[PDB]
Amino acid sequence: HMPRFYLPENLSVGQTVDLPDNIVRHLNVLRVRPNENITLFDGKGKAHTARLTVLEKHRAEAEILHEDTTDNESPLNITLIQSISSGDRMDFTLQKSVELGVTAIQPVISERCIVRLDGERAAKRLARWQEIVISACEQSGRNTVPPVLPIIGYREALDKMPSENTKLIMSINRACKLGDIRHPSGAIVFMVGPEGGWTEQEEQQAFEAGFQAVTLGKRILRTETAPLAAIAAMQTLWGDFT
């Protein structure tokens, strides 16, 4: 119904405060007329209904009507560890994984990274990646915004999660099906490679870090579809798809 806007601020059930410059442009492009209602969520799980009071070319105000009791989150905790890939493959991975309920995203540089990251580029891509995630929350109705964590290398990211986590790498080598894995009890950490794939040594490191290699289905998918299909499969076995 009501257009949704991410506003990382604490809102009081009766306070009228002025909206940031990014929400102003967003309101104007959607042609949202004054006295219509919008949704403001802080990305931490709490949203509010607000009545649009003012809207100008470079200013916006809103009044907080009431608090939305709205939780669309999957109870399953999935961190997608994704090797940096170029353009559409990365953007679609980031956008659709948010629609499918991923809880965090750890971009990593692996051996076969072909994305330029020197200078200011790494920060600029992270910020654009963060904005794609935010937009996907606005569209899919999530009031919790999964973080896009600072870029690190593959090796450093292996030692990050606690031992008790379910640690999965998409790979055809030393694999079982995702359904045939020991029933995960807590959080899931899921590792995906770039276009060029994993190196032989990279697989060994994951195997030594306790990662279980998983396949889904009889054909190996080379595209961003494989991590997306896997997260949906995870929501069906352990998340809010079942």
Succession of helices and strands: EEHEEEEHEHEHEEEHEH
Gap between N and C termini = 26 Å
Strand content: 15-25%
Radius of gyration using CA atoms only: 20 Å
CATH class of the largest domain: Alpha Beta
Identify the strand order in the major beta sheet: 8-7-6-11-9-12-10
Globally, the shape reads elongated
Structural class: alpha/beta
CATH superfamily of the largest domain: SPOUT methyltransferase, trefoil knot domain
CATH architecture of the largest domain: 3-Layer(aba) Sandwich
Q: Estimate the helix proportion, in percent.
A: 25-40%
Briefly note the CATH topology name of the largest domain.
Answer: Alpha/beta knot
* DSSP, total strands: 12
Query: How many structural domains does the protein architecture include?
Result: 2
The number of helical segments is 6
Counting copies of identical and different chains, the oligomeric state is monomer
Main sheet properties: 7 strands, parallel
PDB class: transferase
Keywords: niaid, SAM, SAH, RNA methyltransferase, protein knot, trefoil knot, 2 domain protein, structural genomics, transferase
Assembly: monomeric
Entry title: Crystal structure of a Ribosomal RNA small subunit methyltransferase E from Neisseria gonorrhoeae bound to S-adenosyl methionine
Describe this structure in words.
This protein has 242 residues and is of the alpha/beta class. The protein has two domains: 71 residues, no CATH class; 171 residues, 3-Layer(aba) Sandwich (Alpha/beta knot), CATH 3.40.1280.10. 29% of the residues lie in helices and 25% in strands. The strands form two sheets. The chain has a seven-stranded parallel β-sheet with strand order 8-7-6-11-9-12-10, with helices on both faces. Helix 2 packs parallel to helix 3. The two termini are 26 Å apart. 32% of the residues are buried.
